[PDB]
Amino acid sequence: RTDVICYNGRRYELETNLQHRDGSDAAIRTLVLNLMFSINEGCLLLLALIPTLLVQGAHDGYVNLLIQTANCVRETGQLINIPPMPRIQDGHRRFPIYETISSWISTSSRLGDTLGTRAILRVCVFDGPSTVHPGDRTAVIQV
Amino acid sequence: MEAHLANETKHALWHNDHTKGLLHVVIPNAGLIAAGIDPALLILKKPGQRFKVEVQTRYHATGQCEPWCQVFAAYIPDNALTNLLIPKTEPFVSHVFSATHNSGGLILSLPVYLSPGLFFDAFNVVAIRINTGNRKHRDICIMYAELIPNGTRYFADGQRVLLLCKQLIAYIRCTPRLASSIKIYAEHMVAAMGESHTSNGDNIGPVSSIIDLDRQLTSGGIDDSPAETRIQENNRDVLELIKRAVNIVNSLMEWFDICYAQLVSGDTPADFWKRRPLSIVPRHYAESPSPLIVVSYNGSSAWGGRITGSPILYHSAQAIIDAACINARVDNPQSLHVTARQELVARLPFLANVLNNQTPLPAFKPGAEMFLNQVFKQACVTSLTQGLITELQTNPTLQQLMEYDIADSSQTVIDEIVARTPDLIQTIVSVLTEMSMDAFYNSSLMYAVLAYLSSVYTRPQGGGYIPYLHASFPCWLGNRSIYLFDYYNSGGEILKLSKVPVPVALEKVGIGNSTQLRGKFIRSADIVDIGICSKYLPGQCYAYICLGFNQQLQSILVLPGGFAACFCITDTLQAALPASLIGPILDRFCFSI
């Protein structure tokens, strides 16, 4: 600013409603925080490996599952620096891959905690099937 | 090699100010034998000293100076060549390769000037500061001619890698392990290097492959210059046309890298640059038989690198000067024609500041600090002795005046020293031409005198005089807190006895009338190497002579016997030495933020 869902032949309708900007500031703050926490030093190395990646994937078969949705990723791949192989300050106890994967894990955990509602409700069915049906009565089981 | 590589990111991030180009320079440690110090305390031993090395420039009759450079390095003993050439294999260290008794090495940062107007000459001396004893520091001083010799060794490095690769191949093949695939692919790679070179010649040919530096540091200085390349290509074209006329008329390491990574399972910074040709820029001297090997990166467009074309040659700055000098058959450009002077000014913008005769200085002596400080110390000592002798001649009263803690049975010899004051002053005067001048040329007195003058003439353009670190800490606001006492014997002969002065506390009791002096002491909990000379009682075969000085160049006599003279020599130094003698001092010892 600044629908139809199909599942097993069933269509679900929704009605959106957005007329206030009280949460727009929070949304932009959290998205900019996620963007700032997501950038790392491995992106340059990943972008500097597109020819090798496409060569490896030419005889792999797992290409359509990414190119059916990566309509702009391929276009933006050639619009980057593509630097040559850099030189690390030390080659004994340096590993940016570990740092970037740790940062990604931390950010994923943070976003899962922020977007995850705490609800300790794990029921356990007995005898009958676990699937519930509209119009039946069940019990409460605490785990 | 690790600290310098880590610190290289600061130079890498630099984009503007191309007048400071950092490069890797290796300084051999062959000259450390004459240092006379302990090598153990030079790398890692008793941390706290914080040894640092600074690099500064020295101009000539132009003014200003470089604001130093915060750099540091560490040495490496026990055959540093073996661990810097052969890849690090500490977990599986064995009897690999063969070499003689090697030595250590060091890396020093030296900025270089790169610009369209390169220019080259020998008129600047690089000063290196070492945080060691000022007595015989064993430093070096070279001009800019040795820094940029305009040469590189690109052909001699090819054979060095061949011996190492042959040795490693032989070592791999000598052990019967792994599988036959490695052997067969190594054989295929060897055969791929030549048809008749291996099938009809030899595969490896160890013969007499001994790791030594015989033809590597002797020839190959000027071999890849553009003129040499043109001559070589002309010769190759001539040979090709000769071969054509004779004919007409008669009458690839990918597998090796993978296997090395699988076997060694360890990387060192001295392996990535082995795949590309290196550059060697040695600069030896007769002072010590050790070449100054210089290594330059090949993957960057730095000085000496050859990755895109012709590197920096430092040309177009000598032919014009030679033509101007030979036009009138006069070497000195000062006595040349007006047209020659105008041409020199136009071609060399930096040379226009010498023709106008600005900031006059006698001749061109960059190394003037030594004898300048010697002359200043001699003048200060002569002024001090003149003041003390005049005050002694005009000294009122007689014998002792105040109490003085003197034993009853020891006072019979105290007056003997006082009665021999003319003999003492005569000996002091006469010793100026007999005592060695190498014992008081780098003491704390000259440093304190130099720091005292920092208050006056705080740069022609201003400055707060705020150093960062490693500066005159005892002399910051006043010299009345820390004193410098020199102990000398009595009689007809005076010679140096102590080694390092120790401050002695002093206070006045009486607040008027006959002033009294009674020294005190301050308990210190930071050092234990303190002499007991200062704590010695006034008795016990008399005592020494003390002459303290404050921050106002005021000397108070502490001679036992009830004699005390106060004279100021702050105005005598200015009268004898004018303000034109502090030119180099202000040029060098100045800093601003």
Side-chain angles (χ1 to χ4, degrees), chain A residues 66-98:
Chain A
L66 63 106
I67 69 170
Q68 100 281 22
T69 184
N71 44 269
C72 280
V73 187
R74 40 170 181 258
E75 306 208 5
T76 55
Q78 32 194 334
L79 295 177
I80 211 67
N81 197 350
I82 322 182
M85 170 134 69
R87 276 291 97 219
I88 323 168
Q89 325 300 103
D90 190 39
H92 294 282
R93 36 174 203 165
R94 299 290 117 79
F95 220 58
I97 305 111
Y98 207 92

mmCIF file of all heavy atoms in Angstrom, chain A residues 66-98:
data_model
loop_
_atom_site.group_PDB
_atom_site.id
_atom_site.type_symbol
_atom_site.label_atom_id
_atom_site.label_comp_id
_atom_site.label_asym_id
_atom_site.label_seq_id
_atom_site.Cartn_x
_atom_site.Cartn_y
_atom_site.Cartn_z
ATOM 1 N N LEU A 66 12.847 -24.359 -8.622
ATOM 2 C CA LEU A 66 13.237 -23.009 -8.244
ATOM 3 C C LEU A 66 12.961 -21.969 -9.319
ATOM 4 O O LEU A 66 12.658 -20.822 -8.979
ATOM 5 C CB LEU A 66 14.726 -22.964 -7.871
ATOM 6 C CG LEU A 66 15.761 -23.305 -8.944
ATOM 7 C CD1 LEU A 66 16.471 -22.049 -9.429
ATOM 8 C CD2 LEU A 66 16.762 -24.320 -8.417
ATOM 9 N N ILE A 67 13.037 -22.334 -10.604
ATOM 10 C CA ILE A 67 12.819 -21.342 -11.658
ATOM 11 C C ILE A 67 11.349 -21.086 -11.947
ATOM 12 O O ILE A 67 11.033 -20.113 -12.643
ATOM 13 C CB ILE A 67 13.501 -21.727 -12.985
ATOM 14 C CG1 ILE A 67 12.808 -22.933 -13.622
ATOM 15 C CG2 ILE A 67 14.987 -21.979 -12.776
ATOM 16 C CD1 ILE A 67 13.258 -23.220 -15.037
ATOM 17 N N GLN A 68 10.436 -21.922 -11.443
ATOM 18 C CA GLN A 68 9.019 -21.624 -11.624
ATOM 19 C C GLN A 68 8.591 -20.406 -10.819
ATOM 20 O O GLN A 68 7.586 -19.772 -11.161
ATOM 21 C CB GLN A 68 8.163 -22.835 -11.240
ATOM 22 C CG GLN A 68 7.526 -22.764 -9.854
ATOM 23 C CD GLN A 68 8.485 -23.113 -8.735
ATOM 24 O OE1 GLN A 68 9.700 -23.019 -8.890
ATOM 25 N NE2 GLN A 68 7.938 -23.519 -7.594
ATOM 26 N N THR A 69 9.330 -20.065 -9.760
ATOM 27 C CA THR A 69 9.037 -18.901 -8.939
ATOM 28 C C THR A 69 10.149 -17.862 -8.918
ATOM 29 O O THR A 69 9.879 -16.710 -8.562
ATOM 30 C CB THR A 69 8.731 -19.325 -7.492
ATOM 31 O OG1 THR A 69 8.350 -18.178 -6.722
ATOM 32 C CG2 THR A 69 9.950 -19.977 -6.855
ATOM 33 N N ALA A 70 11.377 -18.224 -9.288
ATOM 34 C CA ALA A 70 12.490 -17.275 -9.308
ATOM 35 C C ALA A 70 12.546 -16.540 -10.648
ATOM 36 O O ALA A 70 13.493 -16.657 -11.426
ATOM 37 C CB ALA A 70 13.801 -17.996 -9.012
ATOM 38 N N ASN A 71 11.490 -15.765 -10.909
ATOM 39 C CA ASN A 71 11.417 -15.015 -12.158
ATOM 40 C C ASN A 71 12.358 -13.817 -12.155
ATOM 41 O O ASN A 71 12.873 -13.434 -13.213
ATOM 42 C CB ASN A 71 9.980 -14.560 -12.414
ATOM 43 C CG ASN A 71 9.317 -13.997 -11.172
ATOM 44 O OD1 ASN A 71 8.675 -14.724 -10.414
ATOM 45 N ND2 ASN A 71 9.470 -12.696 -10.957
ATOM 46 N N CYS A 72 12.596 -13.216 -10.989
ATOM 47 C CA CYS A 72 13.461 -12.049 -10.888
ATOM 48 C C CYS A 72 14.830 -12.358 -10.298
ATOM 49 O O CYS A 72 15.748 -11.545 -10.453
ATOM 50 C CB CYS A 72 12.788 -10.960 -10.042
ATOM 51 S SG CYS A 72 11.557 -9.978 -10.932
ATOM 52 N N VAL A 73 14.988 -13.504 -9.632
ATOM 53 C CA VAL A 73 16.280 -13.852 -9.046
ATOM 54 C C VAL A 73 17.328 -14.042 -10.135
ATOM 55 O O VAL A 73 18.466 -13.572 -10.013
ATOM 56 C CB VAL A 73 16.147 -15.107 -8.162
ATOM 57 C CG1 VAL A 73 17.447 -15.373 -7.420
ATOM 58 C CG2 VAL A 73 14.992 -14.946 -7.187
ATOM 59 N N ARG A 74 16.962 -14.732 -11.218
ATOM 60 C CA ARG A 74 17.896 -14.923 -12.323
ATOM 61 C C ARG A 74 18.244 -13.596 -12.987
ATOM 62 O O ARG A 74 19.396 -13.369 -13.374
ATOM 63 C CB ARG A 74 17.312 -15.899 -13.343
ATOM 64 C CG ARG A 74 15.823 -15.719 -13.597
ATOM 65 C CD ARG A 74 15.362 -16.547 -14.785
ATOM 66 N NE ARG A 74 13.941 -16.377 -15.050
ATOM 67 C CZ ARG A 74 13.003 -17.253 -14.705
ATOM 68 N NH1 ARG A 74 13.304 -18.378 -14.077
ATOM 69 N NH2 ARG A 74 11.733 -16.993 -14.999
ATOM 70 N N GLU A 75 17.255 -12.709 -13.135
ATOM 71 C CA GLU A 75 17.514 -11.405 -13.736
ATOM 72 C C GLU A 75 18.456 -10.574 -12.873
ATOM 73 O O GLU A 75 19.353 -9.899 -13.391
ATOM 74 C CB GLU A 75 16.198 -10.662 -13.963
ATOM 75 C CG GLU A 75 15.175 -11.447 -14.770
ATOM 76 C CD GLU A 75 14.226 -10.548 -15.538
ATOM 77 O OE1 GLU A 75 14.424 -9.315 -15.517
ATOM 78 O OE2 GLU A 75 13.281 -11.075 -16.162
ATOM 79 N N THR A 76 18.268 -10.608 -11.552
ATOM 80 C CA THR A 76 19.120 -9.848 -10.646
ATOM 81 C C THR A 76 20.466 -10.514 -10.394
ATOM 82 O O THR A 76 21.367 -9.862 -9.854
ATOM 83 C CB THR A 76 18.407 -9.625 -9.310
ATOM 84 O OG1 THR A 76 17.991 -10.886 -8.771
ATOM 85 C CG2 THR A 76 17.191 -8.730 -9.496
ATOM 86 N N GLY A 77 20.624 -11.787 -10.762
ATOM 87 C CA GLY A 77 21.903 -12.449 -10.564
ATOM 88 C C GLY A 77 23.015 -11.848 -11.404
ATOM 89 O O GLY A 77 24.149 -11.706 -10.938
ATOM 90 N N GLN A 78 22.708 -11.488 -12.650
ATOM 91 C CA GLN A 78 23.700 -10.893 -13.536
ATOM 92 C C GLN A 78 23.903 -9.405 -13.287
ATOM 93 O O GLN A 78 24.827 -8.819 -13.862
ATOM 94 C CB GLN A 78 23.301 -11.117 -14.997
ATOM 95 C CG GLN A 78 21.801 -11.139 -15.236
ATOM 96 C CD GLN A 78 21.435 -11.700 -16.597
ATOM 97 O OE1 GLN A 78 22.221 -11.632 -17.541
ATOM 98 N NE2 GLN A 78 20.235 -12.259 -16.704
ATOM 99 N N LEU A 79 23.071 -8.781 -12.452
ATOM 100 C CA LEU A 79 23.182 -7.363 -12.135
ATOM 101 C C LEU A 79 23.902 -7.121 -10.813
ATOM 102 O O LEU A 79 23.603 -6.151 -10.109
ATOM 103 C CB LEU A 79 21.797 -6.717 -12.112
ATOM 104 C CG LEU A 79 21.044 -6.683 -13.443
ATOM 105 C CD1 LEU A 79 19.654 -6.091 -13.259
ATOM 106 C CD2 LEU A 79 21.829 -5.903 -14.487
ATOM 107 N N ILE A 80 24.850 -7.989 -10.461
ATOM 108 C CA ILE A 80 25.600 -7.875 -9.219
ATOM 109 C C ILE A 80 27.091 -7.853 -9.555
ATOM 110 O O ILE A 80 27.497 -8.056 -10.700
ATOM 111 C CB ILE A 80 25.258 -9.007 -8.226
ATOM 112 C CG1 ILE A 80 25.402 -8.524 -6.780
ATOM 113 C CG2 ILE A 80 26.105 -10.245 -8.486
ATOM 114 C CD1 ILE A 80 24.386 -7.476 -6.382
ATOM 115 N N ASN A 81 27.907 -7.589 -8.529
ATOM 116 C CA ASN A 81 29.340 -7.396 -8.736
ATOM 117 C C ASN A 81 30.000 -8.644 -9.315
ATOM 118 O O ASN A 81 30.817 -8.546 -10.238
ATOM 119 C CB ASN A 81 30.004 -7.004 -7.415
ATOM 120 C CG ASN A 81 31.375 -6.383 -7.607
ATOM 121 O OD1 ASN A 81 31.933 -6.401 -8.704
ATOM 122 N ND2 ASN A 81 31.927 -5.831 -6.533
ATOM 123 N N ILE A 82 29.647 -9.819 -8.798
ATOM 124 C CA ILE A 82 30.310 -11.081 -9.131
ATOM 125 C C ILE A 82 31.816 -10.919 -8.951
ATOM 126 O O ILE A 82 32.564 -10.958 -9.940
ATOM 127 C CB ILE A 82 29.971 -11.547 -10.557
ATOM 128 C CG1 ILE A 82 28.512 -11.242 -10.898
ATOM 129 C CG2 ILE A 82 30.245 -13.037 -10.710
ATOM 130 C CD1 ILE A 82 28.094 -11.708 -12.276
ATOM 131 N N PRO A 83 32.305 -10.729 -7.730
ATOM 132 C CA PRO A 83 33.739 -10.512 -7.531
ATOM 133 C C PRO A 83 34.508 -11.814 -7.644
ATOM 134 O O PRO A 83 33.932 -12.903 -7.492
ATOM 135 C CB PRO A 83 33.811 -9.943 -6.108
ATOM 136 C CG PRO A 83 32.653 -10.567 -5.415
ATOM 137 C CD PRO A 83 31.572 -10.770 -6.451
ATOM 138 N N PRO A 84 35.815 -11.750 -7.912
ATOM 139 C CA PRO A 84 36.626 -12.975 -7.933
ATOM 140 C C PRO A 84 36.810 -13.559 -6.542
ATOM 141 O O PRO A 84 36.251 -13.046 -5.567
ATOM 142 C CB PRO A 84 37.964 -12.510 -8.529
ATOM 143 C CG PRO A 84 37.685 -11.165 -9.142
ATOM 144 C CD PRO A 84 36.590 -10.569 -8.323
ATOM 145 N N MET A 85 37.586 -14.629 -6.437
ATOM 146 C CA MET A 85 37.814 -15.267 -5.145
ATOM 147 C C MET A 85 38.600 -14.333 -4.235
ATOM 148 O O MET A 85 39.702 -13.907 -4.605
ATOM 149 C CB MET A 85 38.560 -16.585 -5.329
ATOM 150 C CG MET A 85 39.055 -17.204 -4.032
ATOM 151 S SD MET A 85 38.704 -18.970 -3.927
ATOM 152 C CE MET A 85 39.808 -19.610 -5.184
ATOM 153 N N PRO A 86 38.090 -13.991 -3.057
ATOM 154 C CA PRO A 86 38.811 -13.080 -2.166
ATOM 155 C C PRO A 86 39.861 -13.819 -1.346
ATOM 156 O O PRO A 86 39.982 -15.044 -1.385
ATOM 157 C CB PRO A 86 37.704 -12.518 -1.272
ATOM 158 C CG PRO A 86 36.692 -13.618 -1.209
ATOM 159 C CD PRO A 86 36.784 -14.394 -2.504
ATOM 160 N N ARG A 87 40.629 -13.038 -0.591
ATOM 161 C CA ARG A 87 41.674 -13.558 0.281
ATOM 162 C C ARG A 87 41.276 -13.310 1.729
ATOM 163 O O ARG A 87 40.994 -12.169 2.113
ATOM 164 C CB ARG A 87 43.021 -12.906 -0.029
ATOM 165 C CG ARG A 87 43.777 -13.563 -1.173
ATOM 166 C CD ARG A 87 44.266 -14.950 -0.788
ATOM 167 N NE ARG A 87 43.362 -15.994 -1.249
ATOM 168 C CZ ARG A 87 43.056 -17.084 -0.551
ATOM 169 N NH1 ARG A 87 43.569 -17.303 0.649
ATOM 170 N NH2 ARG A 87 42.214 -17.971 -1.070
ATOM 171 N N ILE A 88 41.253 -14.374 2.525
ATOM 172 C CA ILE A 88 40.887 -14.272 3.933
ATOM 173 C C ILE A 88 42.092 -13.802 4.736
ATOM 174 O O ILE A 88 43.246 -14.081 4.393
ATOM 175 C CB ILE A 88 40.351 -15.620 4.452
ATOM 176 C CG1 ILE A 88 39.517 -16.314 3.373
ATOM 177 C CG2 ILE A 88 39.522 -15.420 5.711
ATOM 178 C CD1 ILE A 88 39.188 -17.756 3.689
ATOM 179 N N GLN A 89 41.820 -13.073 5.822
ATOM 180 C CA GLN A 89 42.893 -12.588 6.682
ATOM 181 C C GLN A 89 43.642 -13.724 7.366
ATOM 182 O O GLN A 89 44.811 -13.551 7.727
ATOM 183 C CB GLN A 89 42.330 -11.627 7.733
ATOM 184 C CG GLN A 89 41.183 -10.763 7.235
ATOM 185 C CD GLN A 89 41.582 -9.878 6.070
ATOM 186 O OE1 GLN A 89 41.259 -10.165 4.918
ATOM 187 N NE2 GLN A 89 42.289 -8.794 6.366
ATOM 188 N N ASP A 90 42.999 -14.875 7.552
ATOM 189 C CA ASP A 90 43.643 -16.028 8.163
ATOM 190 C C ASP A 90 42.982 -17.293 7.639
ATOM 191 O O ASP A 90 41.768 -17.322 7.420
ATOM 192 C CB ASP A 90 43.558 -15.975 9.693
ATOM 193 C CG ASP A 90 44.423 -17.025 10.361
ATOM 194 O OD1 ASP A 90 45.548 -17.269 9.875
ATOM 195 O OD2 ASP A 90 43.980 -17.608 11.373
ATOM 196 N N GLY A 91 43.786 -18.334 7.440
ATOM 197 C CA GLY A 91 43.279 -19.594 6.936
ATOM 198 C C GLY A 91 43.450 -20.740 7.910
ATOM 199 O O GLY A 91 43.625 -21.891 7.500
ATOM 200 N N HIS A 92 43.402 -20.437 9.205
ATOM 201 C CA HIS A 92 43.576 -21.441 10.248
ATOM 202 C C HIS A 92 42.340 -21.603 11.118
ATOM 203 O O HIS A 92 41.912 -22.735 11.371
ATOM 204 C CB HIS A 92 44.790 -21.086 11.122
ATOM 205 C CG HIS A 92 46.097 -21.145 10.394
ATOM 206 N ND1 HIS A 92 46.742 -22.330 10.117
ATOM 207 C CD2 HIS A 92 46.879 -20.163 9.886
ATOM 208 C CE1 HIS A 92 47.865 -22.078 9.470
ATOM 209 N NE2 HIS A 92 47.972 -20.770 9.316
ATOM 210 N N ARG A 93 41.752 -20.503 11.583
ATOM 211 C CA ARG A 93 40.589 -20.553 12.463
ATOM 212 C C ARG A 93 39.543 -19.538 12.024
ATOM 213 O O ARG A 93 38.960 -18.823 12.845
ATOM 214 C CB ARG A 93 40.987 -20.318 13.920
ATOM 215 C CG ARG A 93 42.113 -19.311 14.098
ATOM 216 C CD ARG A 93 42.367 -19.020 15.569
ATOM 217 N NE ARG A 93 43.011 -17.728 15.764
ATOM 218 C CZ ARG A 93 43.096 -17.101 16.932
ATOM 219 N NH1 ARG A 93 42.587 -17.624 18.036
ATOM 220 N NH2 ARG A 93 43.708 -15.923 16.993
ATOM 221 N N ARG A 94 39.290 -19.460 10.719
ATOM 222 C CA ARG A 94 38.308 -18.543 10.157
ATOM 223 C C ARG A 94 37.302 -19.327 9.329
ATOM 224 O O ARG A 94 37.688 -20.151 8.494
ATOM 225 C CB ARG A 94 38.983 -17.470 9.297
ATOM 226 C CG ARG A 94 39.958 -16.587 10.058
ATOM 227 C CD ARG A 94 39.233 -15.664 11.024
ATOM 228 N NE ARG A 94 39.594 -15.930 12.409
ATOM 229 C CZ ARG A 94 40.714 -15.513 12.989
ATOM 230 N NH1 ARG A 94 41.611 -14.801 12.327
ATOM 231 N NH2 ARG A 94 40.937 -15.818 14.263
ATOM 232 N N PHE A 95 36.017 -19.071 9.564
ATOM 233 C CA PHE A 95 34.952 -19.747 8.834
ATOM 234 C C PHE A 95 33.692 -18.890 8.831
ATOM 235 O O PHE A 95 32.858 -19.006 9.739
ATOM 236 C CB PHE A 95 34.665 -21.117 9.450
ATOM 237 C CG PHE A 95 34.396 -22.193 8.437
ATOM 238 C CD1 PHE A 95 35.335 -22.499 7.466
ATOM 239 C CD2 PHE A 95 33.203 -22.898 8.456
ATOM 240 C CE1 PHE A 95 35.090 -23.488 6.531
ATOM 241 C CE2 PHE A 95 32.953 -23.889 7.524
ATOM 242 C CZ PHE A 95 33.898 -24.184 6.561
ATOM 243 N N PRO A 96 33.519 -18.017 7.835
ATOM 244 C CA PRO A 96 32.296 -17.198 7.782
ATOM 245 C C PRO A 96 31.028 -18.008 7.582
ATOM 246 O O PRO A 96 29.940 -17.514 7.906
ATOM 247 C CB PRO A 96 32.555 -16.257 6.597
ATOM 248 C CG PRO A 96 33.551 -16.980 5.751
ATOM 249 C CD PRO A 96 34.421 -17.748 6.703
ATOM 250 N N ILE A 97 31.130 -19.231 7.054
ATOM 251 C CA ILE A 97 29.944 -20.058 6.848
ATOM 252 C C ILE A 97 29.288 -20.390 8.183
ATOM 253 O O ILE A 97 28.061 -20.318 8.323
ATOM 254 C CB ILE A 97 30.310 -21.331 6.064
ATOM 255 C CG1 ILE A 97 30.995 -20.967 4.745
ATOM 256 C CG2 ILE A 97 29.071 -22.176 5.808
ATOM 257 C CD1 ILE A 97 32.459 -21.343 4.692
ATOM 258 N N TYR A 98 30.094 -20.763 9.180
ATOM 259 C CA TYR A 98 29.544 -21.056 10.499
ATOM 260 C C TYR A 98 28.863 -19.831 11.094
ATOM 261 O O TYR A 98 27.763 -19.930 11.653
ATOM 262 C CB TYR A 98 30.648 -21.563 11.427
ATOM 263 C CG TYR A 98 30.154 -22.466 12.535
ATOM 264 C CD1 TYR A 98 30.113 -23.844 12.367
ATOM 265 C CD2 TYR A 98 29.730 -21.940 13.748
ATOM 266 C CE1 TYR A 98 29.663 -24.673 13.377
ATOM 267 C CE2 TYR A 98 29.277 -22.761 14.763
ATOM 268 C CZ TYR A 98 29.246 -24.127 14.573
ATOM 269 O OH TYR A 98 28.797 -24.948 15.581
#
